[PDB]
Structure formats: structure tokens, C-alpha cells
């Protein structure tokens, strides 16, 4: 069939540049052109334009001229997207896709599933710098949990970039654990919480420690969560 492989995720700062690749295989690269479509988080599809696979001539939709350059390397069957003066609004997933034939065998393209889109390359434009989290204990409370149980947790505050791993009691405590997806603040820093529901009769007998690992900043925190 028709295949499209897109380059890995990219984290850049405002004003920087990014080169994104789309390598095609399983068909004559010159038979179908390549279109570029972007999608901002929780937003619709934006048709950026296209590149002619035989002549290499690009065509950009309004607003995509200058800052966005469509390129080709026909010897390795690869289409490229270059973005300069990166803005925070450029954050999103960039898809490469085959475009219908200009004249020959249009029906076959649609019928035999030649309409294929790549997996997409996420481009994150952020002003934030690598930062380890500040981990705070969230002291047990029985006010919002089942009878004879208390909820305790850890606030994993102000880290960048994602991810962090959270475990409890060095992996010995797995039942009743709920690690929530992160919030992204206006500062460009993430925060998340991990909560665990334990028996109320185990507080002050059983020690509870959240183990927080943030590989990008090379930070590991073991935070003891004590009853207040």
C-alpha cells in the first residue's frame, strides 16, 4: 500500500526554526502530490498548501507564505516542512498526506484507499525552560472517600517539559492510586496530582511516600505524606 512516516516530536522556543520530514514509500512518489495540514490543540484542520512531487514547486494557502517553506528530496522520497520565526500559536500537530491525482486514475485513488495521512508530527513552541518539580504533600482527609478510608496525595508542581512518573511506596502501593493528567499554566509549566485512598486505621502505622521522577531535569523526589 501507500505509506507515510513522519519525524519525531519537536520542542522549540519562540523565534526558533523547525524542519519536519515526511518520507513516502510503497508507490511512485511522483504519482500523487503531498499536502500539509496542521491542527492546533482542540482546534480544527488548517490546509497549509501543497508540494508538486515531480517539479518541486510549492503552493501555500493565505498566511502560510514566507514563514513556511515546503521542500523535497526526491532521491530519498521525502517531503519537508520548514517553519521560521516560530510563534506560540504554531504549536500543534503537522500532518503530511497524499493528494488526489491531477488527471490519471482519480477513482482508483479514492476506491483502493490511496488517500493516506501520516501519523502527524507534534511541534511544541514554548518559552518555558527545563525545570524539575516542587513536590508537596496533600495530607490525608476522610471527607470525600468511602467509610474507613482516607485520601492522601502529592502535588507535583511547576515542571517542564512532560513527563513525570509517580509511584507510591517504591511500587509497593498500587491499589487505589489515581494519578491525574497535568494542567499547563500560563507560565508554560505543568502541574499534576497523584492521590491514593488507604484505610483510615493505617495512618500513623503505615508510612506513605510518593516517588516523583522527572527525567528531563534529572530530578527524583521521595515525599513523605504525613497526617496533619
Amino acid at each position: 500500500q501507500v505509506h507515510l512516516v513522519q519525524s519525531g516530536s519537536e520542542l522549540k522556543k519562540p523565534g526558533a526554526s523547525v524542519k519536519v520530514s515526511c518520507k513516502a514509500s510503497g508507490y511512485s512518489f511522483s504519482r500523487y502530490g503531498i499536502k500539509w495540514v496542521r491542527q492546533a490543540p482542540g482546534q480544527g484542520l488548517e490546509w497549509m498548501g501543497w508540494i508538486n512531487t515531480r517539479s518541486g514547486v510549492p503552493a501555500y494557502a493565505q498566511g502560510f507564505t514566507g514563514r513556511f517553506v515546503f521542500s523535497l528530496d526526491t532521491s530519498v522520497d521525502t517531503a519537508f516542512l520548514e517553519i521560521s520565526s516560530l510563534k506560540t500559536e504554531d504549536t500543534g500537530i503537522y500532518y503530511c498526506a497524499t493528494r488526489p491525482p491531477r488527471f490519471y486514475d482519480k477513482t482508483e485513488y479514492w476506491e483502493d484507499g490511496f488517500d493516506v495521512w501520516g501519523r502527524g508530527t507534534l511541534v511544541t513552541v514554548s518559552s518555558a525552560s527545563t525545570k524539575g518539580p516542587s513536590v508537596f504533600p496533600l495530607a490525608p482527609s476522610s471527607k470525600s472517600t468511602s467509610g474507613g478510608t482516607a485520601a492522601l496525595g502529592c502535588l507535583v508542581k511547576d515542571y517542564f517539559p512532560e513527563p513525570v512518573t509517580v509511584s507510591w511506596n517504591s511500587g509497593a502501593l498500587t491499589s487505589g492510586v489515581h494519578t491525574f493528567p497535568a494542567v499547563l499554566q500560563s507560565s508554560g509549566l505543568y502541574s499534576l496530582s497523584s492521590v491514593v485512598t488507604v484505610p483510615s486505621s493505617s495512618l500513623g502505622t503505615q508510612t506513605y511516600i510518593c516517588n516523583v521522577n522527572h527525567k528531563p531535569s534529572n530530578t527524583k523526589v521521595d515525599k513523605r505524606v504525613e497526617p496533619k
Binding site: 493565505q62 479514492w110 484507499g113 495521512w117 501520516g118 508537596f136 470525600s144 508542581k157
Partner: protein, 211 residues
Amino acid sequence: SVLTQPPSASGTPGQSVNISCSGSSSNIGNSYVYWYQQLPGTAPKLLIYRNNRRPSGVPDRFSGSKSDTSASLAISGLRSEDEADYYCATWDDSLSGRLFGGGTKLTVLGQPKAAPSVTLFPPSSEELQANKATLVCLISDFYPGAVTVAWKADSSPVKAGVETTTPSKQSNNKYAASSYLSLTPEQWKSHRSYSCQVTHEGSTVEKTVAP
């Protein structure tokens, strides 16, 4: 110049839905309409090509309609797997470019309503010592996957310093979300209380904390 789609649609399993796509004479009417399905975390997938044609693999449950000013995607025998964003696409001959509709997020209510469980944590003493104060409002086990969160300082609303996550599907197929209120230790200490108020399906759950 534009393709107009309603932002949302809903239905229960087995039901039939019709997603609309409005345009003009230069976009729809003379040019072919294409329909794409975008499932969470995946690329758009072709559903309908050339107004009403189904490519191989597309279930007969999906059908496309086309009039002069308008276009439509009908979904028969609705299943929970149909919960996705649906986009209509056409070629603008006057501008020589592809235009997409804003998309219709279709929700399939394949489960009974589930009320949210809410836990509110006050700022830790350790955090106050680091000159920061964060209130943590954790929302879980709710269905459908949409909530609205509102914070209160004493009895009045708070907009500043509020960050709420988008809802996310848990392992148990129910949804979770979190909301955070950023305060100075001074604001925390000078107010009688702070509340996290969670609204879901016309019902409200409120939790309050005091220094």
C-alpha cells in the same frame, strides 16, 4: 469562503444522526464534498468521497448527502466507536485552495450518567513556607465527559488563578479532570474559605476548605 459545521452532536447507541455542512455557490454546489472522521489522538480518516461515495472498508451506516447550498453526513445504527470529530471538506475554485469545516464533535452516550466524585485539598504548610498556595480540586468517575468548574472566595466567584484540565477517559471508561486555584499565602489566610464547585448534567457538587 467558509464551510459551516455545528460544533457538536449527540446520540445513544442504535440511533441515527445527521451532521450538517453549510457553504455558498463557489464552494459547495459545483465542487465535490469530502467527509473525514477524526478519532481521539489519530489523523483524519476518509469516510465519504465525491458527495456520497464510500471507500472500501467504510460501513454502509455512513452516508453522504448533497444539495445546492448544503451537505450532510448521516450515521445509522450509531455505536460508541463513532464518537469522533467529523469534518467536511471541499475545493474553493476562486481561491484555488482546500477548505475544511470547523468539525462536529459527536458524543455517543453509550453509558448511563455517572455523578462526579470531588476531592478538594487546601495548600500544604510546606507550600505556604515556599511562599505559594495551591488549592487542588480532583474530579473523577463522571460520565458523560464534560464538567464545568467554578471557584469561590468566601461567597463570591474567582476567575484569576484558575487552571482546569480538559476531561480525560479513565481506565474504567468514566472521566476525570482537575482544577487548580493559584493564590498568594496572604489571600489564603485573609479569606474565611475557598470553594470548588463542580457542575455536571444540571447537578452541582461543592467542596469548601478554610485556613
